[PDB]
Every structure is written in C-alpha cells, then in structure tokens.
Amino acid sequence: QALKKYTIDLTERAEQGKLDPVIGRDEEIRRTIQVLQRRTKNNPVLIGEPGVGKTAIVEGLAQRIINGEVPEGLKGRRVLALDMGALVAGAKYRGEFEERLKGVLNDLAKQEGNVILFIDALHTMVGAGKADGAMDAGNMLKPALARGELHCVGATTLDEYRQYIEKDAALERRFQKVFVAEPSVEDTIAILRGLKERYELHHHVQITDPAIVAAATLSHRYIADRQLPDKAIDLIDEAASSIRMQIDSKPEELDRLDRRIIQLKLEQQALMLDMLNEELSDKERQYSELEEEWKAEKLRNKVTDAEIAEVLARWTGIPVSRMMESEREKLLRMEQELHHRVIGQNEAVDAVSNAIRRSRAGLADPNRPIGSFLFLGPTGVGKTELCKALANFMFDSDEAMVRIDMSEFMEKHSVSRLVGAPPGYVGYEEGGYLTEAVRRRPYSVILLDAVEKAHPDVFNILLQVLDDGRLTDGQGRTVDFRNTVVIMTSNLGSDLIQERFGELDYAHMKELVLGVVSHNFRPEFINRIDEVVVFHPLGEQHIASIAQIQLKRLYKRLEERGYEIHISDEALKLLSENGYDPVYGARPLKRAIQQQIENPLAQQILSGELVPGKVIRLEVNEDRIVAVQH
Amino acid sequence: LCKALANFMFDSDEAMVRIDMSEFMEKHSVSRLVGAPPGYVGYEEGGYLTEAVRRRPYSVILLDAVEKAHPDVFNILLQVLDDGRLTDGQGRTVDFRNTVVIMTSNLGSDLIQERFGELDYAH
Amino acid sequence: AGAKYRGEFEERLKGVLNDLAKQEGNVILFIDALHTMVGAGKADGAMDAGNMLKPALARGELHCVGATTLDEYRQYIEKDAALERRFQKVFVAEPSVEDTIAILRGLKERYELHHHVQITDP
C-alpha cells in the first residue's frame, strides 16, 4: 500500500499503550467531532498558541475512539498521522511525488471513509514538494477536501497559520478553525495529575500533590514566553530528573564540594603567593563532615514544592528557592550589610532592606514590581553607591545592573531608544534596549540616575512600569517587570535639603520636598512610587568612614602592586580637615585624598625609590603627608 | 451620504472602496494605498485602491477624512483627479475613469457653524 | 550540500532520524549552530530542519544539544516559537576573573606541549 508506507496509525498507538492520558479539553474535542461529521469540509484545524495541547487533543480523540467514548459513527475509524516529510523525501524525478500523493488518495477512497487523516503541522502542507513542476500537495488535496472525501485533522500554530495558510485563500476555506484556549490553572492541575502518574512510573520517583499545584501556580507566575500546560510539565519532569540524579549518584552539595576540591587540587598542582591551601583545607574538612552527615542518614526520595522552587530558580533566575541558612542569615543583616559600602543614610538603607525582605518573604504585590523608589539627595551622598551596593548584595557583583541614566533622555525622542522602534523603521529588529535586557534576566535592578534631567514626559513609560510592570516594545511583545527593582535618584530640592535638614524632622522634610517634586512631576507618576526618601549630607564621622573605605580600596589596589602601606592616625585628621565641605558631600574628600596622597606616592614609586614588602607609613609633615620607607 | 450612494448604486453599504485617510498619516503609507515597488516584501499583492479598482472599474471611492493625511499623498490624488490613471509599483496603469472619488472633511467647522445664519450659500 | 534535487535533503535527514530511533536511546546528539539548523533545508517548497526534527523533539525521542549565540537565538529561533519551545534555555554566563584564572591554569599544559616554552603564572 501507500498508507502502510507513508502514514502512522495513532489508534494503533493508543491501543498498544503508547500515547499519553488526555484530560479535560471537552468542548474542543466535541467540536472536532462535530466538524469531522459533516458532508463537505470534513476538516478541522486546531489553532492555539504553541504548547497548549493540540497534538494532545488529536491523540486524546484517538484514545476516546479506542475506548469507545465517542458517538456511533466514529466507532472503528482508524486515525492516521501523515508524515509529509515521508512524502517529500524521495521525489528526485518529476512526477514521483504526485504519484505518491495520489496513491494515498486512492487508498483513502478505497477505505470507505473510515480513516480520519491527521496532519500535524498543517503549514507543512503548502510547500510539500512543489518545484517548477509545482503541485505542492495543496493543489492536490483541495478538490478532495472541498468535496468532503478526506477527513484531514489539521494542527497548526497561530503565527504559522497567518503566514503559511492565510497567504493561500483557497485552502483556508477548506478547514474550520478550532481556537484552542490556553487552559486555566486548575485545569493545568488536573492535567498534571494524570501526567503525574505517567512521569512517576517513568522516573521511579514520587510527586506530591503540593509539588504539582506549586508547579502550576509558580509557572503561571514566573515565565513570560512559554505557556501552560507545557512549562508545568517541564518543571515536573526536570524535578524528577534532578531527583533521579540525587538518588543515583549523591546529593548536590556533595557534588559541589567534590568538584571544588578536585578543582583546587588541580590548581595547587598548578602552583608548582599561594593562598590556596586554606581554601582546600576548609573545603576538604567540610566535605568530610557533610559526607559523614550523609552517612548518618544512610537526601530525598520524592519531589516537593521546594524542589520545584529550586528548578524554577535555575530556570529564570528569580530566587524562589526556600531560604538556605547562609542566604537567610545574610539576608537578615541587610541593614548591616549595606553599611560596609554605604555608611550613613540609614533611612533608605532600612527602607530598601525592608523592600527586599518583603520580596523574599513572599508578601510582595504580585502585580507590581518589588522596588519602586525615588531617592533624593544632594550631590554626592551615595545614591548611586546605594544602588551599586544593592547590586553587590543581590548579585555578588558591582557592575551587574541595568543603569539607564535619564541624562541622555533630554527629549521626547528617546522613548524610542528605551522601547525600540515601531515597525517599518530603522532599528525595528533590534528591540528596545530596556525590554530586551529585561527579557534576558528578569530579576535585576533598573537604575535611573539623574532622573530630573529628562524631558518630563518620558516617565509615562514608567507609569506603565509601576502600574503593572509590563512594557510593550516595538515588536508588540510584553516584557514583564514584576521582579525588577526600579530605583530613581534625583536632587530636585537639594538646596532646600542642605538648608533645612536641621531644625525640622524627617517627616516634614519629606513633606516639603514632596511638594517640590509635585511641582516638578505629575500626580500620576508620584502616586506610583512606594517610598520617596530624602538624603542628608555627611558630617565628619561619615567623612572619616568614607576616607577609611577609600584607603582600603587604595591598599587593595596596591597589594597587587605589592606595597603594604600604613598611615598616621593624624593623617586621617589632615584628610578630614582637607576634605571637609558640607555643600558637595563626599567627592571633594576623594579628590583631596587623590592629590594629597597619591601624588607623593606616585611621585616616589615612579622615582625609582620604593621596593615591595617595605613597611611604608603615611607620616605627616607640618602640612604635607609623605611616605616613608621602613 | 457616501454609504447612501454605494447602497443605491450597488445596493450594499460596504460595496465601495473605503479608504480611511487617517491611517495614512505617515509619508510612506502611500505604499499601502498604491503598492510595493518591486522586489520588496509584499510586492505581488498590489495596493488597496489600485487593485480594488482594476478588479472593478465602476465603483465609488470614499477617501474618508482626507484632511488628516500626510500632505504628500495629495500627489497621488492629483494624478487621479487629473486624469483618472495611476501608476502603481508593479508598473501597470489603472483606469480610474469610471469611478466616483468622494472625499470628506470638516475644515471650516467653527466657521460654518458660525455663519450659516445671515450668509447665503455663495459667501 | 548534496541536494539540488527535490527531497534529497529530507531523504538524508529522515534516514538520520530513523537511525537515531534505531540506536535504542544510546546516542546523544549535539548540534552546533542551532540557528544554522533553523534555515537549513530552505529550498523553494522544502521543509527546513525544523519541520522534520520537530516531531521527534517533543516526544523526547531525540537527544539534541543546541549551542547558539544569544543574538542568533533572538533572530533565528525566537522568530519561530514552535522550535523555540522545543528546547530548554541554559544561560551560560561569561565567567568571572578568578575562575578564568583557574581555567587558564588548567590549559597551561597544552600550550607548553605545543610551543615547547614555559609560561609565568603571574
């Protein structure tokens, strides 16, 4: 035959026990049955976005025919899947393809209409082997489709339907559109209960029903491209795979320490100054201790919701995994941890620590982004440093953040360069700078330093960002900002803030500067911002702490240069008295440090004077501070 | 009134070339109403106006609200109302000379609502 | 390469797929330049590699491993959502400095065997 050589029976596969259990979807399978029992146009197409069970609708109809859960006219119908690549794959000569296809047609006509043809990927029916001698299989099925002779079940995607079928009008009326809806969440739960039984008996593991309902809710929550019930299933199967690797080999922390100790063993072999044997000793001791603890319980045999959280955190980036104790104990000290790079300004430090704790605890607003802040302070009191300290806490990295400074955006133009050009224009297929780089890594920090410089109607983009956290670039798609931490820094009233931070409380200062911002913004915008903090300048103690931190990073640079240098404690007082001005904050301190330390230091190092390893002190002169060699 | 004309002449409201001239507010949606020049993306699908008249040479063309358009679409309408032919991007020519090219506008709305009293129709 | 005749590419690719089904779940497939696999057999009225691999992918019965640049991913795979969901995104970040030093300490032996010279670890 030809049906033996170009089709695959689905009902055979359903009777041989190969196909999945297919749950729900009741109205669309009833409607596919309705379209298949006609006189002309026996041809349903299953339109839905890619991943919503269209192949599962067809294979479930096949299973219902096998179980006899169908009406009477469908009993005995062999549902056949056509392989169109099988038809194309041999017609090297002219006319061989059409012989193949018409032999298929004659055998289907001989089968008395008892075969429901299923063509997966109906966009691969146009362009099925046309050439100069074009018959295409579209212009051959078409008088057999229109006369209802052929019961072709289509299954095509939605953006492929417009491109490859609705650019051929005589074929698009042969088929009938069954708009498959993406399911709900509870329907996804039921679908995962049937497929729970399937993936349990495959991966030899067990899936608790909270792991299912957690996979459903969280994959609805935290994934922007893919759809239910695809991504839910993938989380379940990958959690099962991870548990199978845990059960087969050893737990993951054993593997972390094992690969790190073999790494450091290779590196200490490669050291043949070290500062490596301490780390190897720590890791080998801890690996032996945790191996003994694994022998004590001789870590899992099931799949829980925290497992789904581990996979979803390894899936997007967003920290949904439940708190290990190192992370949580690091997280409690967040107010303390910021004050190793931002000394002073306790207001927004405590505020932002509260914000990220509201995120990690789980009480965030799940429709609005985490951080919606408006920093306000005089020039050089660490606003940009507070945000870079946030990047350093949150990603172990200083310069890993989205810094889109409005200081280029001084016109209504540059809305385009944050959300991409609309179609037909120049950089259309490059997207926005912002929405691309939030579609890559959703969990991040948007930073808008010098936010008042922009033309005042750029912020309407941020009306969208703070209402819902969805932004629509030029390519029509939505990039979901509901994990981003939007921070804006300005100085709209810093004369007033340097003038009246004394003799007024924090509350009335926030009140008055918020009135100033209301003069500079609109009530639409400022009603979105969660907390608009006020920053004060930095007195002498903060200046001394900043001087200490900058001399720490100076010694930290000079350690690779190889010069461990001390300081006079009086020289700190000379830096304080030579860097003190309460109108510019902390940068005159830094450039006074720059001059009055580095210029004798770079003078004497470039002099051919200093040898590494020497005890070097920053002794003072009567006015100078010089480096001595001891 | 334009729907009444098409629903007299062809006995359907939408049996007419409706061209909504407030979609053409860019300079370059003349590509929509005339066609794509050759080799480009949708070349072998003509325009909307030029195709739909070369199908049916007797029909009523409603350019709806012409005054919202980008002003170098009036070049195309100059050629139409000059001689009833038009050169689409596929090289051919259209015979517009059996069509009714009705445009709408309201550009004196304050003025007409002001002085329809106490002024005759000529003034 | 060898196919200006109709169906000759699809012949090869189906024969490959039937061999991979024949190997009984023992062959891991690696496909470098997955964005080359997208526009693969694009002849006039021809399936690409997407339209032929796309059955065997989401039945699990092929063990492909893609390897693509992120800018090639946007233009060549995110433009086609069907093959875009068949895979699993694995972000491979640029390593930090210290781990890169470790990797280069691993690779010193290869260059010492190649150029017969030594390298200062500083």
């Binding site: 050439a131 | 480009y40 | 005749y5």
Partner: peptide, 24 residues
C-alpha cells in the same frame, strides 16, 4: 531513458526601512 529531475530553485526577496524625522 532519462527522467527529468525536479529542482530546488532557491529564491530571493528584499526589505526597505523607513526613517522618521524631527522637525525643529
């Protein structure tokens, strides 16, 4: 006894790109 082989017949297309302009 030769059989005329059906071809592959690779094709081509293009795409323009507009450019708006501010009008100060």
């Amino acid at each position: 006894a030769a059989a005329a082989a059906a071809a592959a017949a690779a094709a081509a297309a293009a795409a323009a790109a507009a450019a708006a302009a501010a009008a100060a």
